[PDB]
């Protein structure tokens, strides 16, 4: 029992209140760093010249923001994709003006959250479980990579990364629609089916299981006391649930295998969010949604507008107003 | 509304002679314009120099006038600046510079007429949309 | 029907190829049949591209991804990337297509006719996944093959016509590479560059001497390690770190391929040396710089002093300073000042863009090249409408760089998911709980409670 | 089970296919002819490519009154010469 | 008493392939007509006289751009009955005037009522609690507030959503430019309920699938389950320890877990519906007055809030003339808001 | 043994019959020229 073996057994111990593990050795310092910088910057950081045109945007609470408008502002367009740690600035004041905090937060967060995915794999190994909960987490994780890293790479600048804020999120979404027509992209459409479908199946499963709870309690108590943690027997009658839902639609549209039902609940939103993530990541390289602008032409050649052309009018209004002082030449090529 | 011979009748030269194109010429002109020209001139504007468009009114005040078949066919052989003062074959696609603009190598005289005809007919169809830019999309 | 249903094998039909894990003879067939599919596509797609190819149009206006790979190797093209002979494209297509029949034949034979297992038939071609010596020997064979493959590229560059060099004086041309870079500080210095802006890690390789010399190093390294892994067996520290199973080996390769797919995505998006813009179209950064260049040229011709024109923000309308002082194009393209390309570098001085060269030395071929690349920026819709999302139909264009980057990001992403899937499963199966928790032996019931 | 004949039973029976090798193409062709005779345009009131506009007008025939809307459409339809 | 009522009751509740029930008398015609009207309209019917748009396969639209569009703004909130004073029994005029839109929306409304009566009816026959019907109140609140209350507060049905893919996208973008709907906290709660619902769905399914007991020998774990087995098929104890150690907290009560999965998406949809009721009256969360006072007086003050309003103003000015043709907006080029160069 | 005309039969055909008719109508539209 030497000191390295003692340390290894504590790191990988299944008795810690929170599991550490080898992934946790990276996860913990990187998430702490990102969290501490985020909180301080959200409250107190001075305005940031996001678009590199010497037009600083105020993101913090002390500089006139509330919870809805506040943000950690992405780093300067003059920096592009250059690495900008604190020690590359001549002073902290320079680093703050140029949006140094954004880079420090996202790089530490992406590291920590990737390790959070490994840590999910790791603990499942130590406890004797099957290993794929982390595969489900890869879908939200891939999405974070798409809006903080992949889209900056394809567009050449972290200043087009998603801001760390509520209104900054909306700004990102609107500009995205103007330049890529994401609503008309099938991968975003699959994403919407993923989350709408996930919400639907969530309420579906919850209502069916809740509707077939076996009577174990009186009317004056919560039905929740009819289940005891660790009891051997199931707490609801899946045959009754299947008999209700099979008659609601038809028999063969209803599950009677709890394992394949629960697999479907896992797979539908995960797959859908993978597609949403891949949409952002492929529109990062400007393969955009369907363009049916002026697709319908009459006999003489007049343009007959469709709803797609009305979408185009909306997108143009977003296009011409976004970053109103940032373009000198007629084409917004990135 | 229909693509009629009236629509397809355009000025042949500056002296007022008209020529009437066939539907096939018009459609061939559209295809060849997309092949050789629309990468800069989509919709009748000019992406590398938005000050000059392909509106008939703009073509009429060029030097020499370009609002007719002969003027446009000549422009595609030996393009000039708007005031006629300089020859710009070295930076604009033309038959004279087909060596450096290889897409011009397989255009025949008949093709130039059809492209020319497309440029003159389209504003009669689209109105302000032709040469108007995003405002009219 | 050996192992050909769920009862015998334990795998349902939707995991049916897992029934092949311990059937090396059928498993050999599956792999050879599949390789035939790859070689089939390469040959057939090339012939399709050739049949649809108009030599007067730029390749990148025609939806081509394979012919550009052949042209880059120096076949079929001359000065400026002009196509001089389409016959080599024909040959490459035909020979791959004919070969796929041979591979398809062996694959179909081994899959359904030959011995299902090879261990009874030949101890040389038979293998056990758990046999660490045999597994590294098969690995060593394939490293030697890969090393020969890398040296074939060197042979083409140095002895069989050369490579297309976008940087060659006079506009780009096929050039024989006579002095490949061999200094290992240069070759391996690429590996230690930051991957961030202005550095670019290995994606920044910008000259053929470094490309050819790096393949010399890679070829020798692969052949050496191939011999090393034939002669040796894994050391004790390596034995204790890995899982030794078929599924585990698959998962390591899935990890490796995912990483390579992401690198390929950035290579084709940023690099204009081994993906020449003459064939693939301009990079995104390139077209953005070309717009700035185009309007600088237009306005200067109208009499503007572009060095001293102040733009609406106070930064130069045309020119400004990078954060380290270099003179660069202005506007939103300030983010792209790391761009280097043959049409632009003649205007570059020690301090960046040189105002005297801008005023006096811009040649018409540069104005042509910047107007072409500005109007062929890699932007376009899924139905191949070229340009910004609000553009109208007219131009049938999506850049090959967008096609190659998006497809390989999608593939690399799913191959990372496959690595997680199979690495997690390989660990669980080796330890014995990939089918669930043993009720009588549930590990958590033997652990102290957390609170 | 609910007593109806299984679907897999029915659609593998020769009699099913004897009947439906006729009824299915007959319906498809009826659908084709609904369009190719131009009847679909007249039933639903949908413009043909040559009837969105009059030859020189560029204004939409937009309905602008509630209770004379029927007459407004009929007037727009006359003006097509 | 076994009269005709009871004999009909017998036939309606026969255990057949498609259950019918008393609710089926409302449900089946209304659902079928709403669906048939949408397919009929998207295949054959134009929007030329109501919107200036092509909108059917017949006109050349594809699956993304077909729609049954709303009626003309001049119809107001008219029921647009086929026998009403606008169409006067003329089926062709009715189609051209937008009669199919109210037809789909009204038969759809009663169809939805019929589906929820069906959930109650079947639940009462089988002997289960009616929580599936209670959860379906959330889709009904959404449909009623977006497709009926919202246009009823506006000038006419024209501003309701049109029934089509790209038409709904236009509806989303209209709501940003005109209502600043992303800023609305009732929408925010809806987003939380929907994304949180999707989260719960994925995480509960993956947890069950990765804490399964080994109840069989096959590598495909699906076969080792029997619908009438009494035992839980996965380990609640191991699931609880895993999540407690990964995330800090975990479910320990499986009945609470599944009630929560009902609660979260249902409550979210209900909140979003309340916000849309407000938008019916233009009672928006459009501005923060404190931001506007500061920004009016201090031309150096800029936030992501003020940036988005500029985007909204672009949306309004550039889409309004085509999107609202009955208003006859003529906006000369010189009044259109535009940044530099673009 | 089994009946032919059931409720299920009616439900199947109220959906399937118009579907085929509509698919023929939409197939014909692919050849319409302006
Ligand atoms: C085992 C794993 C261990 C992990 C190790 C962690 C260490 C750090 C990881 C890397 C972090 C990368 C961040 C920056 C990525 C980037 O900006 O990438 C860009 C670089 C390329 O750099 C560019 O390279 C260019 C080089 O071109 C130059 O040279 C050219 C020569 O032709 C041209 O002339 C050109 O004009 C000229 O500019 C320039 O230098 C640019 O400024 C520069 O940005 O890509 C590259 O280095 C190569 C590609 C790197 C991979 C990209 C990341 C993908 C990750 C996906 C993860 C998904 C996760 C899903 C979760 C579920
Ligand atoms: C829950 C689960 C439910 C399940 C689904 C149920 C489905 C049932 C379907 C019911 C459909 C109801 C249709 C209502 C149509 C309507 O309203 O049509 C509207 C008409 C009023 O007509 C409108 O009237 C307006 C005002 O006009 C008035 O003012 C004008 C201008 O000054 C002139 O003076 C004019 O002559 C004068 O009439 C304009 O003229 C409009 O164009 C015109 O459409 O009212 C009327 O028919 C009747 C109005 C009184 C009853 C309203 C109660 C029902 C709706 C409640 C919604 C609240 C809406 C408020 C916003 C929140
Ligand atoms: C690249 C794709 C690929 C390849 C190479 C293979 C290969 C194989 N599969 Mg797998 N499989 C695949 C995809 C693939 N599969 C997919 C997509 C699924 C899901 C549907 C499966 C599901 C699956 C199951 C459930 C099983 C397999 C099995 C097998 C093995 C035996 C097949 C057999 O005996 O059938 C015999 C079939 C025939 C004799 C019919 C014709 C087959 C030939 C090969 C067609 C070739 C046509 C070709 C054009 C001829 C060219 C000849 C010319 C070159 C001269 C074989 C090695 C089996 C196995 O593991 O056994 C141990 C098995 O049980 N597969
Ligand atoms: C070199 C790559 C490679 C190889 C050799 C394998 C091999 C295997 N995989 Mg793995 N896998 C991989 C990559 C690979 N995988 C990747 C990249 C992923 C992420 C998506 C996975 C995710 C995965 C899962 C989740 C599972 C496996 C499983 C398996 C085993 C059974 C596979 C089977 O029979 O499928 C049969 C093939 C099919 C049923 C066909 C799938 C159809 C796909 C989805 C169509 C894709 C669409 C197509 C690209 C385009 C549309 C086509 C359309 C228009 C016609 C086998 C050992 C199984 C296992 O664990 O066994 C131990 C299993 O459960 N794999
Ligand atoms: C590396 C892969 C790759 C890339 C980058 C390209 C790129 C291109 N192809 Mg090529 N091609 C490929 C593979 C590729 N192809 C393959 C495998 C085939 C045989 C099927 C072809 C056969 C082919 C033909 C016949 C043609 C092209 C053409 C083209 C050009 C136009 C593409 C287009 O319009 O797509 C349209 C876009 C789509 C069809 C989108 C597909 C979406 C898929 C189905 C989603 C799949 C996601 C994932 C794989 C599934 C995951 C499922 C999950 C459960 C795990 C473009 C340069 C055209 C051209 O211009 O030739 C000169 C042309 O005519 N290609
Ligand atoms: C990597 C692929 C691969 C591997 C490992 C094997 C392995 C085997 N094959 Mg199979 N086979 C393959 C591909 C492969 N084959 C192909 C492509 C075909 C169609 C031509 C066949 C058709 C085939 C038949 C008809 C038979 C076998 C048999 C065998 C077994 C004995 C072979 C032997 O001892 O040859 C000794 C070695 C040689 C004769 C040297 C051959 C050198 C080749 C021909 C020249 C090229 C070398 C160079 C590396 C090729 C580069 C190709 C690259 C560009 C792709 C052995 C297990 C036999 C068997 O199964 O017994 C029951 C058998 O009867 N194979
Ligand atoms: C496909 C190619 C391949 C594969 C699969 C293997 C596989 C193996 N090698 Mg072999 N090897 C190869 C090629 C390959 N080798 C080549 C070309 C050479 C000649 C250079 C060698 C020379 C060699 C030696 C001398 C040894 C091995 C050993 C081994 C075994 C242990 C590997 C290990 O622990 O890596 C894990 C990797 C490390 C421990 C590296 C350090 C960890 C760093 C920090 C990770 C950095 C990752 C980072 C993201 C890098 C990004 C890029 C970077 C360059 C900037 C394993 C069986 C060992 C063995 O057991 O021999 C029998 C051993 O001693 N190999
Ligand atoms: C970008 C590389 C271009 C392509 C391809 C084509 N044109 Fe062009 N055109 C371009 C520019 C920059 C200009 C202005 C030239 C100047 O400095 O004066 C033009 C001009 C024209 C004109 C004159 C328009 C006018 O109002 O006088 C015409 C008639 C014209 N271009 C036609 C034309 C044709 C027919 C093309 C395909 C063969 C074509 N252009 C391609 C830029 C580019
Ligand atoms: C195993 C298996 C499988 C798979 C298989 C495979 C994958 C196969 C492959 C195969 C292949 C891979 C094949 C190939 C073949 C080829 C061929 C057969 C070719 C031919 C060619 C020719 C004949 C040519 C011609 C020509 C010329 C020469 C010139 C030009 C023109 C032309 C083109 C005409 C599956 C999945 C099904 C399942 C079962 C099992
Ligand atoms: C060709 C070329 C070149 C060169 C190149 C080179 C030279 C390369 C190299 C490369 C290399 C040389 C690479 C390497 C890699 C490595 C890796 C990738 C590793 C990994 C690792 C791992 C993965 C591990 C893991 C682990 C851990 C960490 C712990 C324990 C356990 C385990 C083992 C699991 C140049 C650029 C000049 C130019 C162009 C061309
Ligand atoms: C309105 C109205 C009415 C009614 C009518 C009806 C009732 C109709 C129906 C109709 C119908 C009932 C129709 C249908 C149609 C269908 C269709 C048109 C379909 C199509 C399909 C498809 C196209 C598919 C596709 C796909 C998908 C989706 C996915 C999978 C794969 C695939 C690709 C296959 C009446 C007379 C009463 C009165 C007046 C008004
Ligand atoms: C509305 C339906 C109300 C039921 S009404 C009821 O129906 C019975 C059938 O059981 C008859 O015997 C009885 O006379 C009649 O009043
Ligand atoms: Cl700009």
Author numbering:
A (entry chain A): 11 to 344
B (entry chain V): 1 to 137
C (entry chain C): 23 to 473
D (entry chain E): 4 to 84
E (entry chain D): 11 to 352
F (entry chain F): 12 to 45
Provide the authors' original text about this structure.
Photosystem II (PSII) produces dioxygen by extracting electrons and protons from water, which takes place at the oxygen-evolving complex (OEC), an oxo-bridged Mn4CaO5 cluster with a shape that resembles a distorted chair. In conjunction with the oxidation of the OEC, protons are released in a 1:0:1:2 stoichiometry for the S0–S1, S1–S2, S2–S3 and S3–(S4)–S0 transitions, and two water molecules are split to produce a dioxygen in the S3–(S4)–S0 transition, after which the OEC returns to its most reduced S0 state. Here we use pump-probe serial femtosecond crystallography to reveal the structural dynamics of PSII from nanoseconds to milliseconds after illumination with one flash (1F) or two flashes (2F). We identify structural changes associated with electron transfer, proton release and water delivery at various regions, including QA–QB, YZ, the OEC and the O1, O4 and Cl-1 channels.
YZ reduction is completed by 5 ms, and difference densities disappear at the YZ area and all residues and water molecules are restored. By Δt2 = 5 ms, the translocation is completed, and O6 becomes the eighth ligand to Ca and the sixth ligand to Mn1. The negative difference density near Ca indicates the inward movement of Ca towards the centre of the OEC. By contrast, Mn1 and Mn4 move further outwards from the OEC, which further opens the OEC. The optimal positions of O5 and O6 were determined with the smallest residual densities in the mFo-DFc map, which showed an O5–O6 distance of 1.9 Å at Δt2 = 200 μs, whereas the residual densities at Δt2 = 5 ms were almost comparable for the O5–O6 distances of 1.9–2.4 Å. We note that the OEC at Δt2 = 5 ms is more open as compared with the structure predicted by theoretical calculations and the OEC structure solved at cryo-temperature, as evidenced by the lengthened Mn1–Mn3 distance of 3.5 Å observed here. At Δt2 = 5 ms, the disordered components become ordered again after the completion of the O6* translocation. All of these residues and water molecules become ordered at Δt2 = 5 ms. By Δt2 = 5 ms, the structural changes in the gate area, as well as the high mobilities of water molecules observed at Δt2 = 200 μs, disappear entirely, and Cl-1 becomes ordered and returns to its original position. This indicates that the Cl-1 channel has been restored and reset to the subsequent S-state transition.
